[PDB]
A paper describes a structure:
Notably, the N-terminally truncated CysGΔN16 variant was active with metal ions available but inactive in the presence of EDTA. Indeed, the 2Fo-Fc electron density map displayed the structural integrity of the enzyme in a metal-free state. Thus, we conclude that the divalent metal ion is crucial for the catalytic function of CysG rather than for structural stability.
Here, we characterize the O-methyltransferases BelI and CysG, which catalyze the initial step of β-lactone formation. Employing techniques such as crystallography, computational analysis, mutagenesis, and activity assays, we identified a His-His-Asp (HHD) motif in the active sites of the two enzymes, which is crucial for binding a catalytically active calcium ion. As expected, BelI as well as CysGΔN16 adopt the class I methyltransferase Rossmann fold, characterized by a core domain of a seven-stranded β-sheet flanked by α-helices. The HHD-motif enables regiospecific C1-carboxy group methylation of their respective malic substrates.
Author numbering:
A (entry chain A), B (entry chain B): 17 to 229
The structure:
């Protein structure tokens, strides 16, 4: 039921999640070591495992309640660990072929977003990839209003239980998002050699950066 | 026939054309004057008319055989004119509230792309909007290969008659695409106050610029 509600709250869910799965599957070996930052119930891990049965996934998140949902989903998988940690805590050593994230880093202050991309590159092997599926701000307040009408169109066409869209609205007034080109530039500053926006549906986008390639 | 085959050849058709319709509908009045550049059989114009029944449409294209198809689709539509004209020819005076384009400007050399953006802004009213649904090149040759596997992934999942993808591959030898951020910078250079990439699916992207807003 949780899986259906995310599809309802996020436009072009398949396109954007899928694009994170595909860019990782064309960047990394079948036996890659992957870190999922703020994995929550571990949906992005799920999509990755569906593509890459032989990959070793570390799921990390500050919320023990969210990771117990992840643990449930991955009950009978041997190649899946869990790590209780804040994004601002020392990252695991790795190294990792891939670090992936969905809808988490927009909860950090801008400066801590720049400090995280630099620390993520340190635990990435050469040729490794960083993939973010992210809530982005429009570049002007006029466009932000258009972004909002488009997100709200998708939610209502999806027949979202109102109680759940009202909650959605409230979680969103603590968010600290930014335009997708500011974030992508920060990848370049942190030293990723190549950074690109792969797919986008107004307020949501999949971007990636590569360490060497 | 034709309409189904475009859905087959073009990932995220509904998202990409749809985002062109929706950014125009939130940018211009119901009675806006719209120019469709390289309108072809005039599928973008159709989408726009479905959304804006009181808008005045001018469909322009160098190919008279394409515009014959457009004339057929708009047989019974009184607010629809046609203009046979090259992108390099003097644009109609207008003014227009919107100038829209789908899968045409990528056929120009890069400097004639920059020159067209500049001439297009001159025929737009203040606060008018330029929208391009476009074939874009990745920023690296390695990513270009990935964009190509994603476009080829959709075509085969869409059960495309091979004879038609064959043709597709050849027409693509005369294409002069460039990455989406270069093009969007050129809107800013040509004097649009705001430019943004709305939606994207690897090799296809919807972007826009605003003349004053
Ligand atoms: N500073 C921080 N450090 C670690 N995790 C954080 C965090 N701020 C938020 N989170 C976690 O980030 C998650 C964002 S919700 C999205 C979760 C999941 N990846 C999905 O896409 O469906 C939550 O589980 C939340 O607990
Ligand atoms: N230099 C040019 N001037 C005008 N139209 C051009 C052009 N180069 C290509 N075109 C036109 O651009 C079209 C490319 S196909 C895209 C057709 C239509 N816009 C759609 O959404 O499907 C063809 O109709 C072709 O004649």
């Amino acid at each position: 039921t949780y899986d259906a509600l995310r599809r309802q709250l996020i436009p072009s869910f398949d396109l954007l999640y899928g694009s994170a799965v595909s860019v990782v599957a064309m960047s990394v070996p079948a036996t890659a070591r992957i870190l999922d930052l703020g994995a929550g119930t571990g949906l992005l891990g799920a999509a990755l495992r569906e593509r890459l049965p032989d990959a070793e996934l570390l799921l990390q998140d500050r919320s023990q309640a969210m990771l117990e949902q992840a643990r449930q989903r991955f009950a009978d998988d041997d190649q899946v660990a869990i790590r209780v940690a804040d994004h601002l805590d020392e990252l695991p050593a790795g190294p990792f072929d891939a670090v992936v994230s969905a809808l988490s880093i927009h909860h950090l202050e801008h400066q801590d977003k720049q400090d995280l991309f630099t620390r993520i590159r340190k635990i990435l092997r050469p040729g490794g990839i960083f993939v973010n599926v992210e809530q982005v701000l429009a570049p002007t307040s006029e466009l932000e209003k258009m972004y909002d009408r488009q997100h709200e169109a998708h939610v209502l066409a999806s027949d979202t239980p109102a109680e759940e869209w009202a909650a959605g609205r409230e979680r969103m007034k603590h968010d600290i998002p930014i335009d997708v080109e500011t974030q992508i530039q920060w990848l370049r500053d942190a030293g990723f050699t190549t950074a690109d926006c792969l797919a986008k549906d107004w307020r949501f986008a999949t971007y990636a950066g590569w360490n060497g390639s």
